[PDB]
Design a protein around this ligand. Structure first.
Ligand SMILES: [Mg+2]
Ligand SMILES: [Mg+2]
Ligand SMILES: [Mg+2]
Ligand SMILES: [Mg+2]
Ligand SMILES: [Mg+2]
Ligand SMILES: [Mg+2]
Ligand SMILES: [Mg+2]
Ligand SMILES: [Mg+2]
Ligand SMILES: [Mg+2]
Ligand SMILES: [Mg+2]
Ligand SMILES: [Mg+2]
Ligand SMILES: [Mg+2]
Ligand SMILES: [Mg+2]
Ligand SMILES: [Mg+2]
Ligand SMILES: [Mg+2]
Ligand SMILES: [Mg+2]
Ligand SMILES: [Mg+2]
Ligand SMILES: [Mg+2]
Ligand SMILES: [Mg+2]
Ligand SMILES: [Mg+2]
Ligand SMILES: [Mg+2]
Ligand SMILES: [Mg+2]
Ligand SMILES: [Mg+2]
Ligand SMILES: [Mg+2]
Ligand SMILES: [Zn+2]
Lengths: 53, 203, 86, 122, 50, 118, 158
RNA sequence: CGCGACCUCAGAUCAGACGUGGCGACCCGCUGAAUUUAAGCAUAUUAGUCAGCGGAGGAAAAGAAACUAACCAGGAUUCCCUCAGUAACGGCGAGUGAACAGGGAAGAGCCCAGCGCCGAAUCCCCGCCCCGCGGCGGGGCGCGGGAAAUGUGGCGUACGGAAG
């Protein structure tokens, strides 16, 4: 499909983040917390949520 | 606070973190169009120290001025006159490309007012500037006392009288002994005060 | 065959009455007025002719709104009031 | 007789429109008299009938728009014919409330450090 | 031109109604300085523009 | 779900009608081209009354913004007579001269004696 | 083409000078406008000094003029602090302040501190609401006799 | 695959607003010549002038020092007298040419971002009640909707400031 130019842009930007040599300061955010640790951290942080208005 | 780290991080620009960031942003900004709205500032600390408080009614644009000097807009060669004014190709323009950026941003939006602007990227053939714009007839702007100065008719199109910071850098003013040819209101006012006979009544 | 016998072919006209300035200067092939530049949003005006300025500035025509705003300014734009009746 | 816009004002809407209607009829009959060639009385009278139509229509439009702004008295958005039509910059001028708003910095400065009332012995 | 447009014909209608002379009950007025219609126009001599 | 045609086209979205919180102009403007202002006076020329006698028409001077249908309904409301047809022109003075052919039911010399022209 | 003997000179009329010539026929209209404005301001600040605030002894800078004392811009912060006057209360009770002035001597500082104490002796501060006097307000005997002094308040002569 | 967040971005005759254009004497930004003078002329001069273009206001701009100074030191900006046809520039030819200081007109100072500490303490909009309404504003109630943590408000700004 001839995609729109914004769809083309936001896809091939991610292609460039796969291509270019990403420095480690920006690389460290693709190494992320795995799923069964993230869900127990969120069920801990659900206890301490700030107050609704 | 985070903004101190953000300003020192933006200060280090040949650091490969910031070379990667400015390169990828500049790629994306060339793929985009010339005068398009940015949804939020790219440099929030620079925006906040130039005047942007992230409330309703402030608008960031992201504009692309084409990079280069200024060749003289004459037919083929042919400036018909004395050999001082023969030159066309190596001429430079009196105002910064940052000011030209604020100018065409505030021309494209005439209902808004150019607060200030900053730098985001460059390459060989374009420079990119993000412009801060205040909508004066919004009431979060009009009911706040220390920003309802923008809502007055004197401040109409600041970028074209040359009153934002990128325009003030090109008028040659400021205190000093370096700035004698603007004393008075401006350079033209200096010249006009100097080249008039004050022919008194009693001489 | 340059003069009198070439003034005979003058039968198809160039300009016509413009519809912003009322003068017969609206060109038909360029379709722009010569005295005011009609399809431009801005009135054609130059400083090398102060006489072409003074032929139509604010004072020339009727000032159908602006003389009324002058005599409203001399009482400072009162609205909603009437004088007290008899 | 001599129609006057003093006593056309309590007159209600359909009665004013019937007055307008037979004034229009009378003006058209006087115009036919003008074309066929009538008398100086009717040729004088057509001005009286035209200004009669004028002040009947004046009373109609005034009494309509008085009711319109009395209908839109309390409301927040009201039509552009009913808004105050002063000059454009004077409508885009800030309000006498909004230009009276002072920040709390200068509220407290005007509290603590008021302008004083002094005089100097010579 | 018998193929007139409406604006042209309207303009010509105004000029030929303006082309009438002075009414003779004017030159007995008190503050008068008029003796004829100076702005007249004969169709051979002056060609009206357009 | 699949895309067969390789052209992306804009998704058809929902657009509401105006629900304005106040009318722009308050009261609608009165019809200034009404049935009295549309026809002004009839002609009483020798040609016009030759046509009243022979062709069973009346001859009127109406204003330029008229229609044939408008002055047809005008003569029908002002003089209570129906109209066969209407033929209009713009005089060189600037007015719109109309020729109102009545029905064979009615007679224009009678209606002219009614409305004064003779 | 000069004559026999005479000063050869450079008149600066080679430009277009007639288009830019400022003639002074509104000189006396300007003087009357200024003194009308001066009378209006001097009566609208009604017991306060017409000359404005008080301004310090300060000494002219250079080698040509350092023997001369003028009236300056405003009292320095060091001077106000030694005279006890708060830097925001001074502008209200009638004292001019500038924050930019240094003090590199002691003679000039003691002159200005003495001048501030002399001013606080001389001034008559009316109460804030007149029916309710307060502590730092002058007495009702001299509240009636307070008036505008014309000329510069405590003039500086050399 | 579907659902739900957020992010980038579109369409609305969506609700409410706003800019366009004119005059243009004075003002701000840019562009900007050649006549003319040099007894020619090319650098200069005319001249940052005319013409061109954009933008305002009742005045505009400037303005509270990354200043002047070199003194026993002055102290925002603007204007006037003077400095001074001086220092200086210039085929050092013709021509060009400021500022400091001093005397006067006037006189006024201030606010952010950052560093912080306060449960976002903040702002806009819809609906109803009361008041006032021809500068749509004040008070109350909404388990009303948004903005905002990618930072609003309060204290605080180089004259230091905050906490105890
Ligand atoms: Mg030359
Ligand atoms: Mg610079
Ligand atoms: Mg042609
Ligand atoms: Mg123009
Ligand atoms: Mg002929
Ligand atoms: Mg001789
Ligand atoms: Mg809408
Ligand atoms: Mg020469
Ligand atoms: Mg010569
Ligand atoms: Mg020559
Ligand atoms: Mg030059
Ligand atoms: Mg010009
Ligand atoms: Mg404009
Ligand atoms: Mg104006
Ligand atoms: Mg100003
Ligand atoms: Mg100075
Ligand atoms: Mg001398
Ligand atoms: Mg030489
Ligand atoms: Mg020069
Ligand atoms: Mg000086
Ligand atoms: Mg004085
Ligand atoms: Mg603050
Ligand atoms: Mg904050
Ligand atoms: Mg400072
Ligand atoms: Zn035209």
């Amino acid at each position: 499909v001839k995609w729109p130019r914004y769809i083309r842009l936001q896809r091939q930007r991610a292609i460039l983040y796969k291509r270019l040599k990403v420095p480690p300061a920006i690389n460290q955010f693709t190494q992320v917390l795995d799923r069964q640790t993230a869900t127990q951290l969120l069920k801990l942080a659900h206890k301490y949520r700030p107050e609704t208005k | 606070g985070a903004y101190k780290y953000i300003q020192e991080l933006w200060r280090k620009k040949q650091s490969d973190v910031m070379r990667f960031l400015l390169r990828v942003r500049c790629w994306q900004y060339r793929q985009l169009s010339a005068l398009h709205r940015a949804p939020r500032p790219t440099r929030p600390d620079k925006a906040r120290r130039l005047g942007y408080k992230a409330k309703q009614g402030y608008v960031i644009y992201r504009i692309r001025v084409r990079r280069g000097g200024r060749k003289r807009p004459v037919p083929k060669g042919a400036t018909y006159g004395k050999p001082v004014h023969h030159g066309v190709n190596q001429l430079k323009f009196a105002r910064s490309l940052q000011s030209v950026a604020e100018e065409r941003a505030g021309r494209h939006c005439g209902a808004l007012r150019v607060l200030n602007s900053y730098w985001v990227g460059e390459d060989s053939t374009y420079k990119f500037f993000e412009v801060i714009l205040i909508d004066p007839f919004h009431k979060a702007i009009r009911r706040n006392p220390d920003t309802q100065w923008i809502t007055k008719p004197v401040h109409k199109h600041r970028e074209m009288r040359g009153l934002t910071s990128a325009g003030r850098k090109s008028r040659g003013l400021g205190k000093g002994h370096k700035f004698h040819h603007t004393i008075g209101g401006s350079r033209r006012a200096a010249w006009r005060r100097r080249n008039t006979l004050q022919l008194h009544r009693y001489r | 065959t340059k003069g009198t016998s070439s003034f005979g072919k003058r039968r198809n006209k160039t300009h016509t009455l413009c519809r912003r300035c009322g003068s017969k200067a609206y060109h038909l092939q360029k379709s722009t007025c010569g005295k005011c530049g009609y399809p431009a949003k801005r009135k054609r005006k130059y400083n090398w002719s102060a006489k072409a300025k003074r032929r139509n500035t604010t004072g020339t025509g009727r000032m159908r709104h602006l003389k009324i705003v002058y005599r409203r300014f001399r009482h400072g734009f009162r609205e909603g009031t009437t004088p007290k009746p008899k | 007789a001599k129609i006057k816009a003093r006593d056309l004002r309590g007159k209600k809407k359909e009665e004013l429109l019937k007055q307008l209607d037979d004034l229009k009829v009378e003006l058209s009959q006087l115009r036919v008299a003008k074309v066929t060639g009538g008398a100086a009385s009717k040729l004088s009278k057509i001005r009286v009938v035209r200004k009669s139509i004028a002040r009947v229509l004046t009373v109609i439009n005034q009494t309509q728009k008085e009711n319109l702004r009395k209908f839109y008295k309390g409301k927040k958005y009201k039509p552009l014919d009913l808004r105050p039509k002063k000059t454009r910059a004077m409508r885009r001028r800030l309000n006498k409330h909004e230009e009276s708003l002072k920040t709390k910095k200068q509220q407290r400065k005007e509290r603590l450090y008021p302008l004083r009332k002094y005089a100097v012995k010579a | 031109s018998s193929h007139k447009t409406f604006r042209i014909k309207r303009f010509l209608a105004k000029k030929q109604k303006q082309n009438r002379p002075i009414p003779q009950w004017i030159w007995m007025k008190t503050g008068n300085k008029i003796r004829y219609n100076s702005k007249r126009r004969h169709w051979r001599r002056t060609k009206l523009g357009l | 779900k699949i895309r067969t045609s390789p052209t992306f086209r804009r998704p058809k979205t929902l657009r509401l009608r105006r629900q304005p919180k106040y009318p722009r102009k308050s009261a609608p403007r009165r019809n200034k081209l009404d049935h009295y202002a549309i026809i002004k006076f009839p002609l009483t020329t020798e040609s016009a009354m030759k046509k009243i006698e022979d062709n069973n028409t009346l001859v009127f001077i109406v204003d330029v913004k008229a229609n044939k249908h408008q002055i047809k309904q005008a003569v029908k409301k002002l003089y209570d007579i129906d109209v066969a047809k209407v033929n209009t022109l713009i005089r060189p003075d600037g007015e719109k001269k109309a020729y109102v052919r009545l029905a064979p039911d009615y007679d224009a010399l009678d209606v002219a004696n009614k409305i004064g022209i003779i | 083409a000069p004559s026999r003997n005479g000063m050869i000179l450079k008149p600066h009329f080679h430009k277009d000078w007639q288009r830019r010539v400022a003639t002074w026929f509104n000189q006396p209209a300007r003087k009357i406008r200024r003194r009308k404005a001066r009378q209006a301001r001097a009566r609208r600040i009604a017991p306060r000094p017409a000359a404005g605030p008080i301004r310090p002894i300060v000494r002219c800078p250079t080698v040509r003029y350092h023997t001369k004392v003028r009236a300056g811009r405003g009292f320095s912060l060091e001077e106000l602090r030694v005279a006890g006057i708060h830097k925001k209360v001074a502008r209200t009770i009638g004292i001019s302040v500038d924050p930019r002035r240094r003090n590199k001597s002691t003679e000039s500082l003691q002159a200005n501190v003495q001048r501030l104490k002399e001013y606080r002796s001389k001034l008559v501060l009316f109460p804030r609401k007149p029916s309710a006097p307060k502590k730092g307000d002058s007495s009702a005997e001299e509240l009636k006799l307070a008036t505008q002094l014309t000329g510069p308040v405590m003039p500086i002569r050399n």
